[PDB]
Amino acid sequence: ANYLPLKGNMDGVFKYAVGFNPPVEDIRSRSQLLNEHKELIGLTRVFDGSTLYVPKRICEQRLDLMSTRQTDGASIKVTISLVDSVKNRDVVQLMNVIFKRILRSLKLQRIGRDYYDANSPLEVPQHKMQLWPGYVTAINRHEGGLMLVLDVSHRVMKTDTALDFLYELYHFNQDKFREEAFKQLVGSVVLTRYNNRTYEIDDIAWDKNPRCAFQDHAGSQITFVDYYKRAYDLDITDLEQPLLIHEEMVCLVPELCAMTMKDLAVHTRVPPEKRAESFRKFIQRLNTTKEASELLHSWGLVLDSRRECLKEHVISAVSLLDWAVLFVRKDQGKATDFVNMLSKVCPPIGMEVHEPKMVEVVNDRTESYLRALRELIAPRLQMVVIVFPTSRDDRYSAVKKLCCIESPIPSQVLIARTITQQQKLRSVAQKVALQMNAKLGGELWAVEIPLKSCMVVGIDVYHDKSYGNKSIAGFVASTNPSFTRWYSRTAMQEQSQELIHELKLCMQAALKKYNEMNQSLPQKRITTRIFGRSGHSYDNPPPGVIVDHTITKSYDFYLVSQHVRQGTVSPTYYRVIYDKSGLKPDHLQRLTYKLTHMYYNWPGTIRTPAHELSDRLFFL
RNA sequence: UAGCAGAUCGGUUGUAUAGACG
RNA sequence: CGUCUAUACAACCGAUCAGCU
């Protein structure tokens, strides 16, 4: 629990405005219309256009007055007067520019989305990487009123810049530098400093340098160093920095950008309880700092003062009478000792496996499963076990596409890295034994269910490439009231809006299988912490906590079933199904809590539907 | 790519405020 | 609104890593 409210002016914060006339040179030509506004009203103010927020409730429509600029001294339009009323999308923004004034006062910085304090950061130069001790201050409307979220985010901004990165790339070689940049630097992304932007790399200019001119906003051929010296007040040191692109030219100079522990991970990065010290420190720092608090009292910002189923028989486990494994010649020990270990794990979980027909492929490539699999696979074969050390997507899907698309047939794929572990070997075999038996169509462990006719179908959309727009990630389902029949399928359609209709085909493919074996018709991530409305303990909510009113954002349920040992608990957020079908939210909390145990790859608790320790010193 | 608890780095689509190019 | 944007709010995905069986 590291979340702190900020009270003060809950409502009624109206806004003045700032005129922007005329823009001449650059973005600074418009931004300077308030850079020299200290002579009119005072320092404590924020400018973002036609909105200049005020704590009080005055502003209605519009007005105008006069001001002055600095660089050239032309006519300046400024209107610190009536604008509009309070809107739901304004309070978050104006309190966050208040936090911007805080960074101008508390000496915080900003990276991308959230503001960080890095005046005395965690300088860890082992890999030219500096973990910023700032907090993710994503202030927004929250439980009840307004609340400031604070997680101590070790934001990984590099002290080194693209200048030295390209210089060490040159230090490797020059032609090899060019080649590797065309291989390892293209596609990669640099982090900008002057405007904290995110610019990609596709190609690197060669003849260009930080002296060649370009058609700037002024329409002249000015030098490169002059533009950055007069537009952002940043001086360029060297003149031999080749440009990058995001040939058409998108502003990118390696001079002023940057691109991309073990024992520190248990001291001051993410302890479950000891992270409350930062929750107990920054709250005091805001108040006790006279210089920082003085500029916040003017605005009106006052912060708050404060399973063992490996031994019990399984419901209905399908045995393996005749089957084969598709191991390569390099995995003779693997997928056979594992099967031999599977011959020991299976009897406790109520099934037996005979030694498979040890078929094999001819080479460690795709053009081995095309022939060897088809030659020695018949409807008399139950299980196919495919293992390989290297794991590439095309070859794995090459073996897969001959098993799932044509017809529903179980197929188990393993990798070397899954099996190399010896202490996990008994454990990994248990998951696979449950995985194979789930794919065999056999029942597995269940829970005490005070429920029935429930769906466990976990949709997953794989939308990565427009050319490969297939949405193939899996359509895991459950076709028995005990939720022990997990026969995964895949989507076989492609459409943007009519996806509501064609996704039902997989639902029908899962519901028809439900009717064919039962003869009866039956948004998962946040950065929040939950302090449930049952007991005030600012700690991990009990698994299955019921909070849906005045202790969360909206009527959507926000549940906890994901048990934590290292790090602070991050509750999972959930949408609603229906509030009129008669489903009590408490049972849906239980249903999510019970379905949490039903993922058939880990005997315990998981995040989503798809104990009395750490009291004394833990690492001391 | 047997599954995961805590995060981190990016990309993208977003969504809101407003501006300009027609 | 097609585009370019600055301010942010927000999600998903990919990968990576500080591994409860």
Automatic annotation (TrEMBL):
Molecular function GO labels: RNA binding
Domain of life: Eukaryota
Keyword set, alphabetical order: Cytoplasm, Developmental protein, Differentiation, Metal-binding, RNA-binding, RNA-mediated gene silencing
Main localization, broad class: cytoplasm
Subcellular locations according to the entry: Cytoplasm
Residue ranges of every copy of the Piwi domain listed in the record: 383-610
Gene Ontology CC: cytoplasm
Residues given in the record as Mg(2+) 3 binding sites: 620
Binding-site residues for Mg(2+) 1, renumbered to this chain: 460
Domain PAZ positions: 161-260
One Gene Ontology term from the biological process aspect of the record: cell differentiation
Similarity remark: Belongs to the argonaute family. Piwi subfamily.
Protein known as: Piwi
Covered residues, full protein: 242 to 987 of 987
